[PDB]
Amino acid sequence: NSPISPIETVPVKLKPGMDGPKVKQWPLTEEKIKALVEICTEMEKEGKISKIGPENPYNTPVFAIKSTKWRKLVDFRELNKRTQDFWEVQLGIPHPAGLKKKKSVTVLDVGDAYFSVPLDEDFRKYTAFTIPSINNETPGIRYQYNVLPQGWKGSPAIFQSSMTKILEPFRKQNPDIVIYQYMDDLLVGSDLEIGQHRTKIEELRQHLLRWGLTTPDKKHQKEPPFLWMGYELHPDKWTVQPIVLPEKDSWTVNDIQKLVGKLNWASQIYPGIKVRQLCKLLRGTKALTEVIPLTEEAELELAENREILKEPVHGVYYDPSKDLIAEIQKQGQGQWTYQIYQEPFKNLKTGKYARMRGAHTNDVKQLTEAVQKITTESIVIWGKTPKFKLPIQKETWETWWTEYWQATWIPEWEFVNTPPLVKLWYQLEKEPIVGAETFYVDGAANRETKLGKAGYVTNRGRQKVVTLTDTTNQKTELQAIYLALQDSGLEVNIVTDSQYALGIIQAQPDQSESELVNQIIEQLIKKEKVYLAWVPAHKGIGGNEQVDKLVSAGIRK
Amino acid sequence: ETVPVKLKPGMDGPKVKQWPLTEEKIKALVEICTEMEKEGKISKIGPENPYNTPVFAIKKKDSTKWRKLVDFRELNKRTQDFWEVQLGIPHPAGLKKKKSVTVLDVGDAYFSVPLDEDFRKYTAFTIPSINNETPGIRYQYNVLPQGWKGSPAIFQSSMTKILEPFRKQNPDIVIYQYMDDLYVGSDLEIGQHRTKIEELRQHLLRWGLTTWMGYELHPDKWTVQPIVLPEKDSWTVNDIQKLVGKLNWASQIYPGIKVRQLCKLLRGTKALTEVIPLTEEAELELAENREILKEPVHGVYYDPSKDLIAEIQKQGQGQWTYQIYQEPFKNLKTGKYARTNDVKQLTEAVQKITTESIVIWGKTPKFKLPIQKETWETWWTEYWQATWIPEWEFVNTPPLVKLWYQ
Ligand SMILES: N#Cc1cc(Cl)cc(Oc2c(Br)ccc(CNC(=O)c3[nH]c(N)nc3Cl)c2F)c1
Ligand SMILES: [Mg+2]
Ligand SMILES: [Mg+2]
Ligand SMILES: [Mg+2]
């Protein structure tokens, strides 16, 4: 016997061309028929459903399951396929680090959200269902919904929307009060003295009650800390709910996935959490019950994480009258960690970034991407970008951005001497090196056999050719460059016709998915001077024509 | 009456996500929309509307007041039959030949014409909140909106009545409407041109319409950016190798380009720093090549049924090169933009190139932008000043394509 809201209905349609559902009712046991008859009778008294007849041709199946308490289950799959699309409710969830501290906060959960909002009258006919007769002998008892049903595609959206309209006048009345709407919950914060706040909560409840929406009284409302979506929300801090990292001699994939999920969740406030090595154990074909022995690295990473977690850490709330400061540290091969604070060193939140963009990259590019990721996240959480502190010298950043072919722009930042610092590990000469040997390199792979050759000729009369199996044209062009690097002294000029190889090497990579690129990088760092130049293939260009003929022998023409 | 509008058969309306907005811009948008709602231009909508188009706030060129910019790119694609085929505004070939073209914003014209009731739902947009605190604020248009190519299509008949006296009294002035703007070209001395533009402003004013580039455009000034070849008192192997490479790729665009003679100089396995004297044959081959590159490309024509593509290269020192084509190497236009960070400069180049395209062909190109998608999307609105938005995608061309255009 709960209120049905006198809010206006949202008009609702079937998808164009589609008619309503007509799914036959399967016979039910007497026990289930009886349970359903009394549930429906009671719901009809409350105005939630109404009885109809066989004039209405639509139907959706109904079921009951049991405990002593019986529940009615309506299977709206078919109606749902035929119902229009709606606007999605939540485009994201509030992050606690985004909340501004209030003197007093109350959570009001709306009791039976959906059943108190009325369904558009023109749409009710499509919600028809039938309690069957015993052994389907006579016609069933037929009903239709008057309110938003459980499991129907439009209920979530039409509820939030109804709740929005109902709150609007109260908001204008009470502009100082914040009210967040998340699913069934209203989250209500004020900076009033605690008595005047308890009063305003009472007004809100009455306002909601006047619109047919019931809520719990003061004696029944949750007290802080609030547990909510895997977070703890206290009066002056917030954290993630406690993380139990299970101990175990043996680890199933299922256990490792669950561990990784927990560590990922912990990383938004515990700084320095790492999951790289634990994630390496999950790549590959893997049933959920198959045991995976932890590698040395995964054990080290786990022990390190356990240390970070042993003492609890909490974050602070947001103060809009102050800048956000974001710091980023390099943690290792491909791993970055960050903290955002307003007053050093009281973090609002933390996080990690470890993403391979492209097959080959360097630390300057990775830091830029990390900055870009933190920038977007800040706009979402706080509505503004933070000022950055980055372990890269202004001169290193300048050199890189002005020479690089892509547009890049880090917003306001400062250098901070928190090693390891981000640098470039080698550079290419802009000019040919006098007094250094010139290597003309090339590679060729056969498409059928997958055999290939890589090699060089040099202006000093040297030549070499190595033979390769199960290779590709790309691989042989990089093998050729690798050869010239191993056989050359500390200064060398290298001429290639591979735009592919050139492009990779000119971006000054320090890390790569390719073993071969890593070996080239390793060599490039040991040299004092390297000049790398490109020429087009098959133009009879001096040194190139001869390495070409050499590596093409037995492979191509 | 309202002019009925249909979608592309089996096309549904746009469902595009709102990119995140700073607080400052959210607040600006809330103020703008509250006012537009009171004037009846937009109305709040319920959840039974599943459509969305993104919105942004920008500053016009000199002004410091916020302006709402709706991204109707998706809606424009989905209503192409309506605005291109059914109600197409023909583009004058003569505009690009005028000494001066002035660009006047006439977007306010549209807010006085009601939008067809059955179409309004496809114009839905959302003002988001910070930290997903509150649900975003949802509206649709009741009137022809700015940024929809359907709007000048429908207002066409009215624009003609408004402009009739002025066109009749000034038969050699060319006036072209594209999206929310008027392009007005004359061959007058600039004083008289500006005088006539002020006259035109007075006509528009009687119809309730108040009012990377200079004041005016000068499209008779625009001219080819040639591929240029270096000139040197002496040539190394490395230098020649570089020139052969640059000519090799130029030969894909320009026929007749020859390298045999230059390649004959490089025979053997030579040191890169070794100086090579040019033989007479090689000299004249370079002279012939140099002459070819001065003249334009035979056989390349605009095709109105194909999309325009624009490629842009970062050249360093605040310089950017670009090419517009429809089939690759069939360059319709090449240029250079010069002279403040990379993203700012890049948005300036994009707007300048789009404007030129509108003037020359009545179409915007699809841009291939040399930048991280996320960086672009975060920052582009900080510097954007146009009321239209071209299509773009993101590329990374590490080649010597940069070295070849300057
Ligand atoms: N459950 C829950 C919940 C979830 C969210 Cl995302 C917000 C919420 O309400 C809050 C609001 Br409304 C505003 C600020 C905060 C942060 N906490 C406080 O300010 C606060 N003050 C007091 N006295 N207790 C708490 Cl907790 C709030 F927590 C409550
Ligand atoms: Mg080759
Ligand atoms: Mg090859
Ligand atoms: Mg070759």
UniProtKB/Swiss-Prot annotation, chain A:
Signal peptide: none annotated. Changing Y180C: Confers multi-NNRTI resistance. It comes from the Viruses. Residues 433-556 form the RNase H type-1 domain. Changing V105A: Confers resistance to nevirapine. Changing K69E: Confers resistance to adefovir and lamivudine. Changing T68G: Confers resistance to didanosine, zalcitabine and zidovudine. Error-prone enzyme that lacks a proof-reading function. High mutations rate is a direct consequence of this characteristic. RT also displays frequent template switching leading to high recombination rate. Recombination mostly occurs between homologous regions of the two copackaged RNA genomes. If these two RNA molecules derive from different viral strains, reverse transcription will give rise to highly recombinated proviral DNAs. This is Reverse transcriptase/ribonuclease H. It comes from Human immunodeficiency virus type 1 group M subtype B (isolate HXB2). The lineage of its organism: Viruses, Riboviria, Pararnavirae, Artverviricota, Revtraviricetes. The chain holds residues 588 to 1145 of 1435 of the full protein.
